[PDB]
Design a protein around this ligand. Structure first.
Ligand SMILES: O=S([O-])[O-]
Ligand SMILES: O=S([O-])[O-]
Lengths: 183, 182, 183
């Protein structure tokens, strides 16, 4: 049974038609919009990246934070340290959700080649709902230990929001967009 | 499917609730140190106490083995410690994955992809593995990494380290006093 | 103690016993090179023999494809291509190990990283088509070596049924310890 899940995910990830269907669904869930037609996975990654750049810049204004772009070496200025703390917290739960669904964190679609490539793919869909805003909220608060405050706040988001449980069907929905009968 | 997901939901329940997390961290402390965690200390405070005890243990080993030492830094001694702990982290990560848990959902260490690996490995690492690294560094051998690898294989085989890790993981999580899944 | 625990305990028994591990490594060598390793060689010595044969194979491939070659290492275009190809193969190899029910971190030739066994299994087959493909693409002087090589390697894995064929190879490699396989 776990083998069947892994073989399904790998099938999707290795077929260019199926990979694009999955990436299109990731885009659709991220933005609430059908993915633009006649665009490759690389083109969709570029469009997502320019929208994300714009989202960070708007959040910076909305929280009064000085900002030129996302940048980090865990370490950086306060805001970038906060964002890293928050997204790393989310990567942990996202990995648990991927494992819960029987899939491999390492086998991605938009991201590839790293231990958490599929984690990056999935976390990116939802990270702007509350996780990245919370990083900006903490940075603006400027508390004594901002990374710890981010961790505390994100653990509470995931506990209260049932993030893990909700991610599991989301991951299955993303893969089901390949239109291959799921396990 | 359902069983598989239930293990992860249990681990996350424990890790995301500040009260439950502290129960797990206090159990880890007691297993590691052979005495209870000080009362009225947060996980952050316990992490600092652990860190000071770890610095003291490295100091004591360096003094006993007669090895030059200026703290943990990620010459020969730090290379040997890294080789030894990497060996331990691999069998710990494998045990965690096989137990059905997520390596990234930790308790003392939180937010790196291997946080729970560090938590579990840290319970046992100073018993034999780190002392062995000192013994080998002190010999100043021609191939220290290989010597450390072979010694660590022998420690894990002779100590039944893997067979013990899986119940250890369950014992630690069970300290949250939530019903484990099937 | 359950099927997954049982498989891990089997793989770890093999990997931690110096005699069993050498039997496993000798099987890996035979599958890789199509002949038995020399008598009384240690794993370390066999790793060295593999290294020298690999150095020679890269040199031959460079000559055959007309690619400038200054050795294995962003680096030069050929090293970028080899790295993209082998990274792609690692992903499929990890999926195969996980599907077989075994641990990516518990290796035989390579030991001590989260992907040591992945590196062992990948090395058995990587010179069949994956590394030659890296040389073929490098010879085109691609502006996008990572993208082009991964496209090409996904097609190799899809068309060759690489993941499915790796599963029995992994099981056979472990079987060479002459310990009764699980269940
Ligand atoms: O546009 S900013 O000043 O809120
Ligand atoms: O220290 S080990 O050999 O039990």
């Amino acid at each position: 049974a776990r083998s069947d899940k892994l073989l399904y995910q790998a099938k999707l990830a290795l077929d260019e038609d199926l990979r694009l269907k999955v990436v299109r669904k990731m885009f659709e869930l991220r933005f609430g919009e059908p993915a633009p037609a006649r665009r490759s996975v690389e083109q969709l990654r570029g469009i997502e990246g320019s929208r994300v750049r714009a989202t960070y810049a708007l959040l910076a204004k909305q929280y009064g934070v000085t900002w030129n772009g996302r940048r980090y070496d865990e370490k950086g200025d306060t805001i970038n340290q906060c964002i890293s703390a928050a997204t790393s917290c989310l990567y942990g739960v996202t990995e648990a959700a991927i494992l819960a669904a029987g899939y491999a964190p390492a086998i991605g679609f938009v991201h590839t080649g790293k231990p958490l490539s599929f984690v990056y793919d999935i976390a990116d869909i939802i990270k702007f709902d509350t996780v990245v805003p919370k990083a900006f909220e903490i940075a603006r608060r400027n508390p004594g230990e901002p990374d710890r405050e981010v961790r505390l706040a994100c653990r509470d988001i995931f506990r209260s929001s049932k993030t893990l449980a909700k991610l599991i069907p989301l991951i299955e929905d993303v893969l089901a967009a390949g239109e291959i009968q799921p396990p």
